[model samples]
Every structure is written in structure tokens, then in C-alpha cells.
Target chain A: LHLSKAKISKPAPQWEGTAVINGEFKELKLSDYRGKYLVFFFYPLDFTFVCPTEIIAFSDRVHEFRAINTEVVACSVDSQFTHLAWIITPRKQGGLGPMKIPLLSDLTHQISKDYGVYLEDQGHTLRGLFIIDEKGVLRQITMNDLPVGRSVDETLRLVQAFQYTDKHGEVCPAGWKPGSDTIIPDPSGKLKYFD
Target chain B: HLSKAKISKPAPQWEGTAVINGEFKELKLSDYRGKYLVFFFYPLDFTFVCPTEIIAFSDRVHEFRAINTEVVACSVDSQFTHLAWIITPRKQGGLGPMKIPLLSDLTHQISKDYGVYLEDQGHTLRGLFIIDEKGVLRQITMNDLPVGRSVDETLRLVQAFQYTDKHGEVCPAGWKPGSDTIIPDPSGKLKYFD
Candidate 1:
């Protein structure tokens, strides 16, 4: 049996493709997000009413991510043209009204394959989300089978937690938020957050 | 490197001592055969590392049980420490009477098999795995040490997998119970889109 090609704590697989950025067709690559953390997510399909809920959810909360020096990019197997059209389509009409994040086109399917989110038989990607650090190391990997949506808030928290650890060298416990208590990854019990 | 536990396949097997309901008992993966299992791995016990999230699941154990699911949290710490954490009060940084079992992976084989064991750090990453009733690995979410997981999201995923299993319908993104689901087919019919 084959497993996903990508691994955590390793350099994220490089990818290059055309993307619909700010409603314009432009070329983008994984390296373009270098020096900034990235929340790279994949959805199964486009032109469907159901997928926009997750896509728009991330787009609506892009500012929260940006405020923490992270950029998000949504990807699907759809072409760049289809991505642009979806952006132009009205939200009421079952399309992404205006996307704050760039929508990458995995029409070549290589990007999906590189991330191991490609559904070989389905011609689309899974609901896989990856958090890549500034050095392009894959910090987190979440793969949800189709029909389940990823959480924007969870993704935001993860990126922030990673950035926080990078800066302070402290570890975040589960359900952590900014300014909340953090732990030092100490082997000895010298550090104490509690009495 | 990839974990031996792959999606849509049998979850990695394990048999170990666990602290369940204030008693140290032998537990294993097979014990959860008939129910969906939310098996997760955190770094350690008794530290600010994971008690809040562990306690979160314990607090919400009823929600999971209501959906015919079971929750088990594992860490590299010894089962004795897990019991100690359970006895400690919540205000004192202890888990304080957990509803979920705390499986001990003192040998770290379970962690290595799951592909979440951080060798240099001597504990596992924040890895949450969802295994269906059939024992097949359905979903996986792994975070770095500092990030905690959401009980709501974990519940939602268990429900989502249960929903897909029972109805054979694909769950749309951000789907919750009582939410409309997409019919799994290729007839070009957008039931919810139109």
C-alpha cells in the first residue's frame, strides 16, 4: 500500500501553477509564499454550491491569518479560468463572491499529487490542509475525506501556534490562543506553570 | 516518513495498559471494535502540555457516547502518571477524573507506528485520529506540539464519518448534523447548489 509522499517537519513539496489571484489569472508557486507561513488547503470540487461554504469561510477570515503573518491559498483540480469564474459568480448564485485569498488551480493535478491529496480515481483532491512554515517546512498536515469540511478557526490557531513557537521556543498546549499560557519543552520538571 | 496507519485501512494495532474510570486495566485497539474511536496522542501528562484538551474530551465524553463513539487519549507517559493526573484536581494542573481512558505508550512503539513520535522531543506530536466502527482509519489530523485540538471539531468529524457510513452520502464542507448532505453520484445534479 502506498502512503502520502509528503512528510511532516520536512520541506514541503514544491509546486508551481497558475492561480486566480484577486480575480486575475497569475502564475504562482509554493516558493512564492516563502518567508511567510502558509495555510495551503484543498477542496474537492468547484462550481458546486457545497464547496463554497468552506472556501468562503477561509476567505472571510483571511485577515485573522494575515495579521499573524500567514497567507492562505485554496486549491482544487479546477482550471484557473473556472476559479476566476467562480470568484465572479455571486455568492447567492452558489459561487465564491469575492475571495481574499488566492485560489490556486491544480488543473495539471501535480500540485494535488505533490501534497498527496489527489483522489486518483475521482479526479479531484481531498479536503487536505497543510501548514507550511516560513522555511517551507511542513508543520502540520490534516486530511479530511470528502463531505467533511475543514475549519478556518482551527487552521488559524495552528498557524499562530507554530509562529509563536518559532519566535519564543515555547510549546503550545492543545486549544491554545494568543496570550494564553504556553509550555517550555523541558525534559526536567524545573519549569512550572502551576503551583 | 509516512505512518503505518493509512486512511481507509485498518488502524495501527496496539495493546497496552490504560487508566480507565479510575482503574488501571488492559486495553487495546480491538476493544473499540464496534464503535467509532477518537484515538489521539499528546506529548505528556501532568504538564500544561495537554490536560486541557484531554479534559475537554473527558468533559464531552457523553457527546461522543451519544453518537455511539468512544474516546481514548494516549501519551508517552507511564500509565501510573496518567492515573496520578486523573487523581490530581483540575485547578492543580491535573486531569481530575477523566471520562476517557489514558493509554500509556511507555515504549513509544505505538507513537512510532502512528508516525507522530518526535524522537528528539521524547513525546508524540498533537495527533488526532478517527477510526470508524469497522476499524478502518478514516481521518487524521496532526499538529505540532504547541497546538491543541478542538473537541467540537473531533465530535463533528466522528459524526461526519458516521453520517457518511450510515447514509453513504458525502458530507459537504463545514457540515454539521441536520445540515444537508450531498448525494454521492456523478449525474451532474447539483441538488444544493440550485
Candidate 2:
């Protein structure tokens, strides 16, 4: 009854279902990625506009996410077979060609509902992008309308910032990248940071 | 059990997925201030009683606009379902080319916040609410699932409420626009009746 209490910095909701991965359909839960930082996003549907761009983009950067000890997954209401068919289909014809990441199918839409991304009236999910830390707590969540696609760059930027703060015990200022200076919340002083 | 809320309170702010003005866009409750909003909830689209209410509002949408108010209908059905029903010809038991935004409360978050959702059935009962230009809830009425709502009464209620808000007077039972309204007084302002 409550809306989106799946708060950030809290344990992300655990989900177990059949996901299509590497040309194989298998059953796995989100907890299986507990030890690894997880990035999963919900698109409205497969075989529609504005969806393939993020899918293919996220797939291209899967290895980058891997470098940060993160795992990337995607989901929609479409079936796994539909996902497989779309993945192999070429970009010229609205098909995603062999994307490297896994595409999970939230058929009943329970996962999307739990994640507060499911658009039940349409029987599909919205453009919701979520990032979970290595502890499986949801860190950052963003959503867009049907006409717009999410920014993979922004998504990746937040991932590194969260990790940077968690590791270095300092704050990542706006637009702060891995190599950028961070702020220290000095207890005895007003503030301390780079000029 | 379901919950019930009263009138003249600050409406809950809810922004979720919606099909508005014929686009599948996101909607927030705060966006429609400065105009009265008639938010009606139905059981589902393409059903028996739902079309009558939605179409009735659609037919009279212009009058609402004249009064600086907008009419929006919502249900648990998706935007796609709303599109389908919108294109369905009235001859074939469908609503054809109607104007008005159909909000898709798919996850029922909007419904639960408004306190009209029947969670057991995974659908909403017929509940209608009127919100004012100040984003304050003005009126709320509900009906059983099988009963169709009265469009004329909704319009009259809107007219009465709008007038009352502007003029600071209350309407009597069965009041119409330009009709005599009571100026409430604590010391019995003679309402002369049977």
C-alpha cells in the first residue's frame, strides 16, 4: 500500500526468477549477486523505441561495470523468448544484436511493482534504473517517461561516486569522478577540500 | 478494510505513470494547481459502467474547461487499454475519439493514496473526488462497483463548489449555478423551510 519505501541506502528487495543470460535461460535470484555490485534497469517493453539504446549501451559498458566489481542486468515484462529474439535481431531492424548482459523477464510484473517501477495499467515497466551496492542495498534509483531514455554516463558516474565515498570515507562533490578531489566533513573545522 | 478521508484537506501528492492528453507521460498531482480538478476513479476500462462515466465527462469536458477546471479519469488498467477503449466505436460498444486524459494508476499507488482502491480484487471501486485550485481536497464520493456515476451531478457539484469558493457562500440541496446560496451565520439566518 505504501509507495516506494524501498528506500535508498537500504537493503534492496530480493527477487528470484528466470533470467535469460548468455543465450541460456536459467533461474537465479538477485541475492546471487550480493557479493558484487549490481546494476539493473527496467524498460517499458522489448521491441519498442527508446529501449534498445540503453540496453545496447549498458551491454557495451558491462566490462566497465565489471571493473568496478559491479554486475549489470536488465528487465521488462516481455518473456525470455522475446528477449532472446530481440537480442539477436540487428539494430537496423529494431533488434538488439547479442548484448553481453542478462535480460530478466518480470512476467507477472511483481518485481517491477516491488521496485516501484511497474506501470500496471500498461502491463509493462517504466524506464527505471536502479543501482545496488555490494551489500545488496539499493543505492541510487532514477526513472523516466516512455519517450526518453536514461543516461548511461550518469548511471556510471553515480556508481563510482558511491563506491568512492564508501571506500575513501569522503564525500564526492557534484560531478566528482574517480580522479577528482572529494570533500572531507571535518568535525573540528568548517570544511576542507581542494580549491 | 478500506480507509476513508474527509474533505477540505491538503490532497496527497502523487506522481506516477499516466497517459495524459493522449501521451503516455508521467503525471504529478501538484502540476494541476490554479484550476479545479475532477479526478474520477473507475473499475477498469472497456467494462460495462466505466465507459458511461468517462464518456459523459468527455462530452462535457468543454464546460469544465470554461470554468478553468480539467477532468481526468483514472483506473487500474494500463494506458494501452485506455487507448484501445478510446478508439473503440460507440456503435460497437466503445468510446470513439474522446478527449480527456486517462490516468493509468497501474501500481495502484495513486488509488491507495486517494483511499479508493479495493486491494483484494486488485482493482478500484468507483470513487470520485474534487480538488480545488489551492490543491485542497474539496469533496469525495464513492459508489459500489456496479453503479454508474452521475455526470450531471458531478458537473453541478463542481459548479456549486467553484462558486462557493469564489463567493464564500454555500449551496443548498439540488443547487444549480446562479441559484440562491445561503450565507452561513451562527445565529440562524432564517433558512425558511418546511
Candidate 3:
């Protein structure tokens, strides 16, 4: 797979890497997530302070992604060993407790670099999140600086709305939500979707 | 000087040793008048929440530099503490190298001038101030100590500031670079919320 830059409204760069999932090591590839929506995020490190907040939040919200028919995955420059370590580590010690989603080890950093999320100097990543559709097109990308844990609520809502927009050739406008006003395509008559 | 009402009030005069280029140098707030400046304050050095923001700003320095805005990080720690932290690599509990200077607010005068100093703790809140090219205080944002700032959002705000300053157009909500800027006459008419 070509592990390189993946721009918005374009096909995502292909990547296959070793991942620690639910206490087991498995090889993961882009095609493995085919026919299903994927929520992929990158954290700066395995045991850092701020990254854990986000990693834990995304994992804790597993029910939300399940409701939307999406598979959530996370990655960092850390190796699978650390991923497994964090997975098994208890919640009291600042480790992600029994993380349900797959945690990919971008040990070589090839995928992180390709995705434009890797911080070269720190040898890690900012809080970069991406949503890939069933058809493998990148629908959205969101990134937060190193300090803040991004808004998981807004992100999930946006992806759910993305699924809605894709069903019909419609665009979500400002203040858009699942049932919010959107610009819809219609050849005849006034648009019903607009306010 | 402040909040439009305090505009051009002359940014609080200050000078202190700053950790830059792996050494210390005296930096003045007045010396950064020619170009725009983004002056921000974090709580302390070698702290958990502070390092994240300091590095994020440093990483996006190029974005600010493109618009001629200089980014500076200030903490209440001494310049010597700042240097030690910068020298310690990230893997070993350090901030590693940084693009911007780290100013020492040891005496808290600079922090007090920015209204960031906290009397109880003797530390500063997470305060960010944007100064224009002509040395006028333009924008100020404060977040709770626990709530960190967004780097991209900050860049967007700075870009919007520069756009309104130069083109005489209103940069509306969600200001993207190529969108239609709001105004009365699309040809050449504008006014600031009047």
C-alpha cells in the first residue's frame, strides 16, 4: 500500500501495520476496514499525560461508534509493546484501561508521517483524528494541539452527520447537526431542507 | 493597551532574560513592535499541561511566521528553570528544542501587566494576547488552567485579524481564506459593524 499523504475528498493512503487489539497482536490494513466506516486517531505517545485523556475518551465512547456502524482505531509512534502495556495497565495509573479499539503501532512512523500527523521533533503526533468512509474516501480530518483533548462529542456528531450527507447529495451548513438544516439537491420546486 | 477601550494603551513595558537558542538574552516587549506578536502565558515550567501548549505553538510557528506574527511563551518560572527544561529531551521529561523564546516572569511584573497573575497561587492563568503591527492590543483570550488552547483555531483567528486589518472587510464566522468576506458593496465598500 502507498503509505503517503492522504488529502481531504481524496482516497486515503493505504497502510498495513501491526496492531494490538483487545489483548492480541494482529496485522491491520486499510482494506480490512473496508465496507465499514473507520474513525482513526493519532496520539503523540503511549504513556504521555494529555494523549491518554483522548485515547481513553475515544475508547470509552465505543458504544457511540457502534451505533453509527463505525470501527474506531488509534495509532502512535510507540511500538506494539507499549500499546499492549497501556492496554493491560489499570486505569488508576494513567493507562488506557482495557481499550476496546485497535491500537496500531506506527513504530516505523511511516504511516504517521504520511498522514501529516507525526511531529518530527518530538517523534510523535498531535491529536489528529480522521474519518474514512466505507468506500475508503476520507470524509473529514480534525487536529488539536498537544495540550488539549479534542472535542469528542462534536467529532462523533460530525461523522454521524457525514453518513447522513452521503446518503443524499446534500451539504451540512453552519449549525448543522443530524436533523439540522442542510442544502439539498433538487431539480424541481423549492428545497424542503433549507430553512 | 486593551479591549478596544484600552487599545494602544502602550503594552506594559517590560524586559527580562529569555531562553533562546539554548542561551539567555534580554528581550523587550517594545522591541517586537514592527511585526505582529502573539504573547501567551502558561502556568509553569516542567508541568504536565504547560509543555503540550508550548510545543504546539512552537510546531505551528511557521504558520504564524507566514503572517509576520511572532509567538512567545511566558511562564512564572525563572529563565534558568526554563533552560534546564528545554535542555532535557522530550523522552526524558523535557520540552526539547523550541522555535520561540521562553520569557521568565520570575517577578510576576509581566504577568501582572497582562492581567494573568493569580494572587493566591502566585502563578498565571492560561492567557493569550494578540498585538497588531502598530503595537496595539487587539485580542485577548483566557481559558481555565485545565483547558488548553487550540493551535489551528489560534492561527485562524490571527489570519482573520490580518485580513480585516489589510482588506477592510469583515471576516465572518468560520473564516476560510477564499470565502466571500461580508460587506455592503462587493466592489469596494466596507465598515466595521457600523
Candidate 4:
């Protein structure tokens, strides 16, 4: 359903729980990432086909996100044990190995429900991705079907574009990328590319 | 949220007016039934980040129609607003003109029925749905307002879904058409690793 810009645009709902990472247990909450840009996403489950590709892809790109002061966190309806097992598993053997980011386990489905990504009957989340700015406000969100994977490069570009616009106040044109020219909105502005 | 109603419910038909080739006319979901449909929703008219997606889809209209898919875009804006935007020159940062029909969900019922309506803002999130020949929702993709969508990926998904249905096999991760598919057998499934 169309979420009101205000509803989806507001700060992420508060969450508090413990998530397992790299064989150690840690308390976690949405507020932990409040001071930095966050990419909070949810997948269906562990040990699935499409899930690993996405989880690993994001993990592989962790440094890129960190370069922009963005932290990535992935969640699913699976338990903490499952998340840990998947992380310890090797990529060639179909597991994400030693990733920098923490994979949150929402065993109760509270986080999924709060994010509006839970498919209750299916008992899993649809592919949900949310981009939260440093102020904890939701800037961009996207969800895909279970079978389809997302583009890490595109997400990075989008975050970069938004960050650039927010800092420069100039608009990024179509297919904009880093180091690209941004236009100042003018009533009489002509197509800069064509001009 | 749980779309209990959407899971088994048949696709909802939306009736609205759209500006097509400079003429305002009434349109309905059923009118395009029996043909593949790509229905997308954006936030507003003449806004940033929205037009990039709209124009990108328009530029690839021929590719969508090539596979018997008709592309229709919807927003909460009025038909008059849509028409004005269409008439606005692209060189001046307006939509200039587009060949595809721009549907208006003026009453907002269509948006609500499709489960893409944002009651708080009175606009749709980036909701996209692909209906097959039987009018069943074969695929859906929704994005938050600030992020734009990828038209190329959407095209690939349509092809993948269509290919799987025709081949009677499942499309694995990143499966493109003409690529290898799981044959849905006990032994065939094992071939995935091989």
C-alpha cells in the first residue's frame, strides 16, 4: 500500500533486542545507528537461495558504505542461531563468512512488522530495504519480491545522490553519479546536457 | 504489513482518466486485460526523482510492448495537472511529452484498492505491479519515496517471469531468459550445485 510520505518518511520505529554476531551476543536497537546513515533491510529467511546473494553482496560492499559514513544492518524472521550459522558458513558453501555488518534476528517478527515488511501468513518478510539518514529520518525505502535481488551499486549511488543534494542544494540530474555535475534549479533552466 | 486480502484476492480493477497523446480519456484496468501490464506509481507530478523514473519507462515503452506488456503510470495528481505536465517542454525540466498514457487516481480508490495508497500523504509509494495474461499479479515491487526505481531490472523481471511460466521451470537467482533453469526434478534440483 502507498505509505504516506510522512509515515514512511518519519524516523524508524524504536526497536530493542539482542542480536547475535560472530558467535557473540550483543544488545541492539534502531537507535544505535542514529548518528550515522543506516541501510536497514530485511530478507525472508536463512539457508534460502536468493537471500545469500543479497546478504553477501551487501557484506562485500560494506567498505563502500562505510566510506560514506553509512552502516548496513540486515534482518530476517530467522532466529539468532540461524543468522550466526549463515555468517559462519563459507560463500562457496552457500554461507556469508565473517561479514563486518551485524545480521539482526527478529525471531518475534516485531521488527518486520514495525517496518511493514512482514507477510504474516507466509511467516517471513518480503525483501524490504530502508535508507535512514544520520538524523534517523527515513529517506528512501524499497521492497522487492522474494525471488528478485537488489543492486548494491544503485543503492550506494542513490545514497550518494541524496547526500550530495542535501549538502550542495543542487539537483542531481538523470543517471547522476559521483563527481557528476548537479544543476541549480532555475525557472528558466534549460536542459544542461542538451545545451 | 500483512496483505491477507491481497494474497488470494484477484487483482483489483481501477477506473480513472488518463491523458493519452494529448487527449483526456477514461481508462480502466480491465481495458488492458488479456495483455501483460506494468502498472507503476510515483509520488507527485513535476517533482524531482519522479520524472527520471517516468521518462526512463517511457523511453523503454517499445521494449515493454514488444513482449505484449502495456505500461501505465499512476499518481494522485489530477488529470489536468498531468496534461499540463505533459504539455510542459522537457527542455525546461518538464516531462515535455510522453507516448505512454498517464493515469490519474483522482478518487484515490484505485490506489487504495491496489494497496499502494498512502493515506497520510494522499500519494502512492513507489508501488509497481506486473499482471500477466490471466490478470494475475505475477510480480510486485515497491520502493520508498526518496529512492527511484530501475526500469532495466523491471524489464528483466518481466522476461524472467514470462520465461519461467512458458518453460515450466523455476528461474534461479539472477536468471535471465535463455539461461539455464532448474528442471524441477529431484535429480534436476541437484544440478543447481553442479
Candidate 5:
């Protein structure tokens, strides 16, 4: 729950919390996601009606993530019961109907604080997304203020780019997507991009 | 002069030599006062897995300019090296030419001020920052070594923040210009939700 522990390229802060998973209550820990990439994000609340759009986007695209051997998890400062309540509610009525990803509850707000996303004044968290590698090293950090929202397509692009670098030892260019040309991480020889 | 940079506050002031349109020129943070600024940092030049990002930004500088935003890319490399990279054609692994200024932080002070400098590596991570017209640091996105940021996302944020600033409304997820914005108060949000 310490703020200073979540540096990029360093091990992500360890967190264990109660979560709402597929309409059931379960205890989940960060270690449970070891050996795979994790797209861990925090929203301000559960029933905001607006935040669910981002949650649903990730949930609907959960299979695309799983296809890349990655997992997505959304977290908030709400209780697991609240999470379950929201999930059971119908989407047309401004509720998240059945989520494919686990909705982690940071009831104590410890997980959000540890991730440096907790907003003390608001008693919730910001739109913070962290991409942790297979070894649990934090690869990316994106923070948006309470008003602004984030993009899932950009998140997917980052995950794929990091995976590509890890698997092939190459680096991705700006706005790089899967199957895009990669460059050698060297300056001495053959620096051409498409070659 | 500030020791640390934070969101919603004035961005740290910086002054350094920059390669602007293939010429070395002195640039300062205060010079971009009347408009928004996208101050970003990359690792190195002519060497890293991809310097094409510089070219990408240059290619799309008009989009940022269309919205009254200016972009400046920075690195710890010297201005001479930046000029060389700018002149080296993209097909040959160089940046070819660029539309934005490439600020040199060879002293690492500017990077240190922005909190993007890697002390051990003597370089920087891919950090993109958006500062408003009044120079408030509004957004920050940091990627660890391998990944590159989306220019579209940066443009989207500048527009989003501008929209919020102009109308006092908030932008929702994946928001772009002309997208549905949330009203600030709870009553308005509920109305929008309804």
C-alpha cells in the first residue's frame, strides 16, 4: 500500500483484495496473475453510469486480450457487493450487465493508494491504468484526471507493443499495431526501418 | 525553477538549445505561453529501436497546430546530434526531417525537472506531457522502454481538455471532438445518463 513502490521498470506493488468475479465473490491477489500480462485499471466508482463504458469496453474485448495471453482487471474503491449489484443490473438501465473481467474491490483503498491513483479529496481513485509484465514489472503508467477518460485501443496497442518487444527483442514505433514493422535496437548496423 | 513537476500546476521552466527546422536555436518553456504545448521525451537518437516517432510527430504537427497546440520533442542527446539525425533520411534509420523542435537536454537538467530522466541509464523513458495554454501540466503518460505513445491519443487529450476548459463539461472515455461530454454536476450527469 505504499505509493513509492510502483516505479516503472520495477516490480509492481503487491495487492490482495476481495473481487466480484462473474457474479460471485472471490479473493484475488496480484500474484495470481503471474506468468501473464495484466491490464490493471482503476475507475472512480461502480455506478457512475459513465465509467461503465470503459469497463464494458474492456469486458467485451476480454477475449481479444486472452487471445494474446493477457488478462484484464478493473478495480475501484467500492465493495464487492456493490460490484455484484452493478453487474446484475441491466446495461440498458445504466448498469453493467455481467462482466467478463473481475471487478476488484479496494474497499480499504489500499490498492489504489499503493498504485498512486487514490484521490483523497474525492474518496475514490483517478483513471489510472498500469500494464504489468509477466514477471510483474510495471511497463506503463497512464493517469487521467477525474474528468478525462482513457482509450482501450491505445491500451491494446501498448500491450501488444510490449509483448512484441519482449518476444522478439525489437522496439515498436509510434502508433504501432500488431504486425507493424519493428526496428532493431542498434545504431551501428542496418538501421533501416522497413528493411 | 521548481524542483518537482505536478499536475494542475505551472510546468517547470526550462531553457536549452534546440534543433528547429534543422537549425540550432535557443528555446525556452515560456516561449510557448499563448498556446498549449505537448512537451515529450524519447530515449535517444539514431540508435534506439525506433526514432521513427520523431518523424511521426513531425508528419502530424499540423493537426496539433490546427488546435493551437505546439509540440517539442526532447532527448539527452546534443543539439548537433539532433541536427544530424534530422538530416539523415528516414530510410537510412535517421529522422529525415522534422516539423517540431528537438530540444537538447544534454545536461539532463530539463529531463530531471520533468521527472523523466533515468539517472542510471542517462536517458529518458517515453514520457508525453500536455501543458495547457496557461502552462499548467494537465496530463502525463509514461511508457517503460519498449512501447511508443499514440499521437492520436495526445491530440485527443488536448482537444478534450480544451473542450472541458471552454464549456466546463467533462469528457468521457474515448472522447474526441464532437463526442458526448458529461455535465459537471451530479444532476446534469444523471440527466445525461437518463
Candidate 6:
């Protein structure tokens, strides 16, 4: 299968599932946040070691993502009940407490399978993080094994850089941040950042 | 005045056993101090995409160690499993005998401490960390399951980090060893590539 040209281009498969946030059960879908950029991520399950770090890190930076008009949604194969239990649990106790983001429960495994994060043999999802622009185009996709966690700062930087490039038509260099100077990609212009 | 919490905490520690050239022994982080350490976590033993990375690193272990850097590969598989995979002969679903040590994070504590453990599946993701001689993490790269890491790029990054540390200069884009580096001049010493 050619992944680069897959049909699920943007808005990320339009998943509809039940989520429990801050002890409140809620329904979630991709269409709910149409006007804003969405950061859709998948993990193996809740109550794990690495997932909490990622979830909490992103949650801690929720204001940063929200400031950029973006939303963060984390998904796993575990049930909604498990996610709720973990959220209410404190960090010192090895649980993510009162997360600011929505945790989706893909218990049926269909969402993970569609996102290509589901390990069929293990009945859990791999570590997959996807970013979708407001127009619903899938801009970035990163997947790794379940043991690792995602980088919140890098992800935010990448999204901001993509937005900057789209708006200004200039390219960002490696490790480029918001205030850093970007390259204009011209023969003589390339020397500006260097000079 | 509102008190602010200090961000940027130190990296965590891990302990486990690894099979070094078919020998099982316990390993810890302190053993590789006073030198650069390239620690990576792979998914499982005898799996596709995992061996490619292991062998590539093994093939270049000498180059890395020559520069005072050590490479350690870890997985959740047992030492016995790693040994079996190491001796099984590559053509018949084995790693064909490697020189580098493959650490077994069987108890999953190493994975948890390193912040790479996946609880539901009882496996780890592909997490790569570069620790400096001071035991501080200089670089961390983690990829979701399907994608394989670039060993060449990692080596280059190690060289770049090490060079910057010693020379007190910054590496530019696509910076390589022996390449021109900016010395943080007031006029901004950025070198232009031809």
C-alpha cells in the first residue's frame, strides 16, 4: 500500500467515539472541531508509563496549542472508563490527573486500524501522531512503537513552522522556532540568514 | 509575585541486563558515564525493521566508539531471546551474530523509567536518546512504530553535538564534522555553502 498517497488525506478518518474527560462522558468526532487545526494522536493504552508523560506534557502546553487555534486529542484502544480512571489519578501515583485535553477510547479498534496504528496481533495501537490543518488536509504523520512518547514542543514547533511557511511561502531551517529567521530560498537571499 | 515552577528537569535513569556477544550480564547507566552514550530502544527480538537498525549501528560501532561514544541497544525481549536471535543465522530469520550488546528490558522498568514503555501491548516504541558525558540528555528522538530511524543522521548529530560542546560553536544546517561552524560573532558568523 502506498502510504504517501493514501485516501485518508485530511481530517484523519473522521473518527467518532466516546471519550471521558474530567469524569464527564462525552462524544467526540473529527467534524466537531471544523474551523480549528486538530492534533490527533494515538497511543497503546492508558495507565502506561510513557503515554502519561506525553499526555501531560501536551496538556501542560494546552494553552500554547490553543493560542495557535489548535486542539489536542489523544486516542488509545482502552475503554473510556480506563481513560477516566487514569485522568482522575494523580501524577505521583503514576496517573495523569485532570487532563485538559480529550482522551478518546477506540475500544472497537476500528479507529486505530483505520489510522494504521493498530497492531492486529496485540490488539493495541502504535504511537501515532497526526496533524490536520483547518482545511482538513493531513499535514504531518509520525508513528513509532508503543514504548516511546511524542515530543510536545517539537510537534508545536512543526505545526507553527508549517503555518508560517504556508502563509509567507518561506522555508524553515532545522530546529526553526517562531522568532527565528526563515530562509527565502533564493540564491542571493540564502546568504541573509547566514550573513 | 507568583512563583513559577522550574521547567526542564533532568533525564531519568534505567537499569537492566543485556547480552553482549552472547554473554548475559547486568548493565546500568553509570557504566557508560564520562563518555557519550547513544542509547536506543527497539520493539522486540527477531522483528522486521528492528534488525536493520541494530546491524547498521553494529557495523558503525567502531566509528562511534573511536570518538569516545558508546552505543547500547535495548528491547523488552529476554537475553535468551536476544541470544537466540543473534545466533539463528540471518537467512533463516536471525540477526546473524552481532557484536553489540542487546539489553533486555524484560521487567519493563527500564522502559518505564526511560518514558518509552507501552503498557497495553507490553512492548516499547523506537526511542533514541543521546546522553552527554555529564549524564545529561542532549538529544532525544522517538518515532512511531512503522518508521525506521536513520543511523547515519544520528551519528552525524552525535558528531555535531560533540563538536559544538568542545569548540563552543554552533552547527549550521546540514552541519558535518570539518564543516565550517558559526562562532557566534557579533556580526553573526554564518557560513554560506557553495
TM-score winner? 5
Off by over 4 Å in 5: A1-3, A192-195, B1-3
At residue B165, what lDDT does model 6 achieve? 76
Compute the TM-score of each model's chain A versus the native chain A and list the values: 0.93, 0.94, 0.91, 0.90, 0.94, 0.87
Candidate 1 chain B, poorest ten consecutive residues by summed lDDT: B184-193
lDDT of 3 by residue, B4-91 (tens): 2122335566799999989999998888988988888888775544666787788778988888889998988998899899987765
Q: In the order shown, what is each candidate's alpha-carbon RMSD?
A: 3.2, 24.0, 22.8, 3.6, 2.7, 17.4
- Score every model by TM-score: 0.85, 0.52, 0.51, 0.84, 0.91, 0.51
Residue A121 deviation, candidate 4, in Å?
A: 2.0
Q: Which residue pairs in model 6 clash with each other?
A: A143-B144, A143-B145, A144-B143, A144-B144, A144-B145, A145-B125, A145-B145, A147-B116, A147-B124, A147-B125
TM-score, second chain, candidate 6? 0.88
Span of ten consecutive residues with least summed lDDT in model 6 chain B: B1-10
Query: By DockQ, is 2 or 5 better?
Result: 5
Q: Provide the lDDT at A183 for model 1.
A: 69
The residue ranges of model 1 lying beyond 4 angstroms of the native Cα positions read A85-94, A167-170, A178-192, B84-92, B167-170, B178-191
Quote the lDDT for A82 in model 1.
84
The residue-by-residue lDDT of candidate 5 on B11-35, one tens digit each, is 8899999987778899999999989
* Per-residue lDDT value at B66 in model 1: 85
lDDT of 3 by residue, A1-195 (tens): 112375545688899999998799999998998888998888777755556666777777888888878888888888898888887776555567787788898888889878866656677776677878899987665554443345566567667666776786564432245665444333221134321
Candidate 2 lDDT, B1-194, residue by residue in tens: 23333344477787766665556787777889898998888887655556666777888899889989898788888889887877777644467876887888778787877767765689887677778898887655554443345565567767776676677654543356665555444322234110
Q: Alpha-carbon interface RMSD of model 2?
A: 27.1
Candidate 2 ranges with C-alpha deviation above 4 Å: A187-190, B1-194
For model 6 the local lDDT of residue A89 reads 75
After superposition, which runs of candidate 4 have C-alpha atoms over 4 Å from their true positions? A1-6, A181-195, B1-10, B46-48, B114-127, B138-147, B164-190
Interface RMSD (Å) of candidate 5: 4.0
The C-alpha lDDT values of all candidates are 0.79, 0.70, 0.70, 0.74, 0.82, 0.69
Candidate 6 docking classification: incorrect
Task: Please tell me how candidate 2 rates in CAPRI terms.
Answer: incorrect
Candidate 4 chain B weakest ten by summed lDDT: B1-10
lDDT of candidate 2 over A48-98, digit per residue (tens): 655766788788778888988888988888999999998887766657887
Runs of candidate 6 with Cα error greater than 4 angstroms are A1-11, A185-195, B1-194
Q: After superposing candidate 3, which stretches have Cα over 4 Å from the reference?
A: A1-4, A185-195, B1-194
